[PDB]
Amino acid sequence: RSIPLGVIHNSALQVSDVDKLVCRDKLSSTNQLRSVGLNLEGNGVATDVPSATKRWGFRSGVPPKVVNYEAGEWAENCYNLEIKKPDGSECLPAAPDGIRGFPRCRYVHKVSGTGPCAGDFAFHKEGAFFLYDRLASTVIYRGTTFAEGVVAFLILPQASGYYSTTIRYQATGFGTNETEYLFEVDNLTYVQLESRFTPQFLLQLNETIYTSGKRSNTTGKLIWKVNPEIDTWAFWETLSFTVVXXXXXXX
Amino acid sequence: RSIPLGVIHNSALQVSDVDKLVCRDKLSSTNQLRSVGLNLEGNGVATDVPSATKRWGFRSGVPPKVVNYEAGEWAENCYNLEIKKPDGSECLPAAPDGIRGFPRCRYVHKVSGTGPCAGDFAFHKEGAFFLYDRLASTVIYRGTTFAEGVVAFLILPQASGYYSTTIRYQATGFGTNETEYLFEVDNLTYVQLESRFTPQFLLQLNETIYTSGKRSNTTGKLIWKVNPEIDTWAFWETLSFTVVXXXXXXX
Amino acid sequence: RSIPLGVIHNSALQVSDVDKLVCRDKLSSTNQLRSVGLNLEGNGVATDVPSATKRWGFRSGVPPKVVNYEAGEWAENCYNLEIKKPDGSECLPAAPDGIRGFPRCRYVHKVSGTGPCAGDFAFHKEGAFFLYDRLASTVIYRGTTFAEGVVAFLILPQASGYYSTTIRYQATGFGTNETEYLFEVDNLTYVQLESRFTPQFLLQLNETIYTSGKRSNTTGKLIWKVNPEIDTWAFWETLSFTVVXXXXXXX
Amino acid sequence: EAIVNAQPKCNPNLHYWTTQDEGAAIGLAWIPYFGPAAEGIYIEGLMHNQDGLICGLRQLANETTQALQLFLRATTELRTFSILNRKAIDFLLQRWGGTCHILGPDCCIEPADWTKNITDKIDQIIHDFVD
Amino acid sequence: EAIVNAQPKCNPNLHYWTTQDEGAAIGLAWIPYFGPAAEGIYIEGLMHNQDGLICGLRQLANETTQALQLFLRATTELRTFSILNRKAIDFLLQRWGGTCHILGPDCCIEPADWTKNITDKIDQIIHDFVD
Amino acid sequence: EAIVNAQPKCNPNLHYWTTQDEGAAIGLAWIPYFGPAAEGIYIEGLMHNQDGLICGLRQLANETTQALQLFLRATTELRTFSILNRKAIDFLLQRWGGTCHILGPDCCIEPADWTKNITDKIDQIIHDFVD
Numbered sequence A, B, C: 001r002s003i004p005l006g007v008i009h010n011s012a013l014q015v016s017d018v019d020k021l022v023c024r025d026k027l028s029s030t031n032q033l034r035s036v037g038l039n040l041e042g043n044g045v046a047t048d049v050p051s052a053t054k055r056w057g058f059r060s061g062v063p064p065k066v067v068n069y070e071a072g073e074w075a076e077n078c079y080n081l082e083i084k085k086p087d088g089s090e091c092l093p094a095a096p097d098g099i100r101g102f103p104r105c106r107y108v109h110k111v112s113g114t115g116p117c118a119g120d121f122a123f124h125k126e127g128a129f130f131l132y133d134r135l136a137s138t139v140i141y142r143g144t145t146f147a148e149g150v151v152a153f154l155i156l157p158q159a160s161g162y163y164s165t166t167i168r169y170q171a172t173g174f175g176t177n178e179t180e181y182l183f184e185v186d187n188l189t190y191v192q193l194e195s196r197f198t199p200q201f202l203l204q205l206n207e208t209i210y211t212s213g214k215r216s217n218t219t220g221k222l223i224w225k226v227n228p229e230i231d232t233w234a235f236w237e238t239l240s241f242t243v244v245x246x247x248x249x250x251x
Numbered sequence D, E, F: 001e002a003i004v005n006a007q008p009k010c011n012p013n014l015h016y017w018t019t020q021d022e023g024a025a026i027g028l029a030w031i032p033y034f035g036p037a038a039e040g041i042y043i044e045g046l047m048h049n050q051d052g053l054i055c056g057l058r059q060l061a062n063e064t065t066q067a068l069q070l071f072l073r074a075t076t077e078l079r080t081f082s083i084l085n086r087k088a089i090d091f092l093l094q095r096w097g098g099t100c101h102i103l104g105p106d107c108c109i110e111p112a113d114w115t116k117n118i119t120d121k122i123d124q125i126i127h128d129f130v131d
Ligand SMILES: *[C@@H]1O[C@H](CO)[C@@H](O[C@@H]2O[C@H](CO)[C@@H](O[C@@H]3O[C@H](CO[C@H]4O[C@H](CO)[C@@H](O)[C@H](O)[C@@H]4O)[C@@H](O)[C@H](O)[C@@H]3O)[C@H](O)[C@H]2NC(C)=O)[C@H](O)[C@H]1NC(C)=O
Pocket: A043, A125, A126, A127, A128, A150, D006, D007, D008, D062, D063, D065
């Protein structure tokens, strides 16, 4: 079960290692060999913060590992975590020297909060990698933007600007069955997050709150709850405010 | 004097680099190339703590070096050192990231104590390596289990559970001509160590002390001395208690 | 624009990558491949401290990079910087593990002082490298002796002791248009430095000050200024003292 | 084997980023002091699903993970940069690591043009036979 | 050279440990989150001194140390992982780094089967000679 | 291309330092505990400008910088040790990465000695023709 290698035969991609190669297949340079990273986004996985975080878990006893890749895919959703334990200690390690954030992210979901963090490192429960700047890791680094993805290896044949937007979230019970999320309008105005909410809906809801004047006008916390009446697949193929801590409802 | 390479010719192992190779000798994959580590145990060296520690010495001005190996040998004796100077400062560096203890050790001789440590790093006086988890180093790391060994490089032809026991020792004048060792029965009961003592004899002596009730029943230190009447080669081919600090004799 | 490779054809050096090579050109071993470092000294650049420091500048946003080389050139002038900001914070990073000073330096110009240091790392403004012990870096490390140089890659054909002298300088406004330098005779005796001063002239001037008794005989600072009457190309092809802080003139 | 995309969805278009390792430098832009910061070293391109290459790439990277993860578990390097270099070496070893038996299936030596250099230069003796 | 064990003793049996780099993964065991910890990634085996291989291995590793230590002194890598890859490259360079003169001692090209493809296909002209 | 030194000056002599990677060890000097410190591992030599090699080397290293700096910008390795190994691999791939068409310009196979093994052993049939 050696590392598969992508090669083009009969106008079709297929796996074929250096030993399953015919004499006609020609490799003139290491330039023809390329490592690439593909985003789990492109396979149809749910990208909302509640769904994405449940694919990650904490585990001890497994040393982290890093492998480089040369080309990556522009991501719609990336993630940046600042998680602490309830006693204030850090759950995630600082980024090692030379590991920078994923370079192309339309939306960076920055999640800050708390959780038990029963493990030395946070891994991907489905075996995928956390993609950084041309480096893929098995673990999550603190405050470092990543995209979920996997790596492929290829033998090549011989042969819109960049906009990024940060979306901030508060979390409690991170990495558990009972995890609560809040979308941050400002430091005092929050919205109870659900998996149905798309990035564009969060930004429009946040704009509506500002442009209509529904931010907290006190020193206390204001949590808006969207009622299920307001509805919200793949990214590439596409109100009245009442107050009742200070919970409220948006109809 | 390039790095020798092991190859099998005429039903016999011999050294023969890539340039001393005949056209019949065939190398179809890097899988045929293997780096292995062999323990100094297998050559008949004395493995007791007094004899083993005298093969190591402290030296400054020589940067440490590390080389990996892929396969190792199950060891009977491994060593784990926590040595400080008399002023409390550490003599050995913390293990670098990714360097773990030797994975197969029947007996781990854990030695804690003091010495002058006249050198930045501790090297092997006979040029051998300190074998860790698939990594061989020229120096000793603090509190990290290692076996003494050497590395070989091979061209392969095309073609009992794991029990571990820790034995604890106290040391004074470590790394000198006048080094004293004490086998630890508990935090208050000790035995003056001599090179004649095998691991199995130390564990049986320690069991006898517990099962007969000869541990210290005060807050002071109890040092048992075995008299030369009680006798104790290769590992693979095989009483009355009187008290007189608190020294004593076991007949 | 791949990395050029030096090869000898028709009794002359020339660039020719592995793909521009004829079948007669033969490479029997990786031993024939060599990376070497050549000093900017050998091309005729000014080596005095005022001229050399202006080729270096501070910049943020560019990660440092390191590449090794196997053979280097004996240098006449090397440099060793201990620069802080006026608030006392360090301007240069500590040398990473395994990076030592350039091994052959006739004169080590050790410059200590202050500057604004408007950048995370100090780079070579002309794209050259800072040569350390068999490692070339794009940035300057704190207190680590380096020579300015560049790297070449070669295919080889099949086929006076070491004296070092440290010259110490004080600096203000380091890395700016208005930078002042002082050659240090002792902790209280200094000479205003100019680009005209060669290393041999600084050592002779320093000897004259000691052997004639012109060091500061108080607790205050004594700055000697050489008047333009006293004159001072390539290194390989070659008085009355009046006092007027305490400035003075040497005629 | 041939690859079969078995994912719930496939984005048939690949908007990619990479680095021009040695792109035509413009003046002083190659000097690190003057060149771009870490965020500005990237080029971009857009690829479409011609010959089903994009959906094949996504499945390939998916199927590569198990072997890649097992390789990472067995290595002690903290960061692995040598996978492609070793694959290039293994490419050469499978073809040239032994004796090349000409006209054999595992020997990539074509004597075509020059079998037609012996079999046509026989006519310099067989009928240059002037008796 | 041939190796001569010159050690005081030899353990003729080799109880070894290594890693199955890509062993047949069992379900989810390849996923780092679910897989074994650092202590449980090892396989074991037992080898005996057939052809004197074990006592030869011990002497070989002993005799390798001087050259290995001198190589480590001369390198600036803190951790060396490339010794075997460079030996594979040097294997190919000694055989294929120059022009392969067929039938020469340093050219590993066997034209055996196909010399018997020319020397037997001469019979398509020499006696297909119908006059 | 050929190199043209375009520097203001050239030191035509090269007083160099390097490491004897495996020099004839003297007794115990190869043991790190007994061997030299970091400052004493160097050998020295002196080279002169025969065939203009020294002034060519200085210009070569000068002209190498742009491509080297761009390579360093594009890599994520903090320290690069693999440039020469990859150049050795690319040497072999350009010569042996495809099918070697004998007598072709890109195939470094010389059948010289052994064309004179067929064309002279024709005389074992053409005039060993006893009728
Ligand atoms: C490569 O692509 C594969 C196919 O897309 C990926 O397969 C995924 O593998 C993970 C395990 O690592 C599966 O997760 C499990 O899902 C089951 C079932 O989850 C729910 O969904 C089904 C319908 O799909 C529903 O009927 C059930 O009642 C469940 O409510 C859970 O029980 C497990 O605990 C675990 O979460 C994925 O389901 C599976 N996806 C698919 C589409 O089959 C594979 O992970 C990819 N490899 C990498 C490295 O990314």
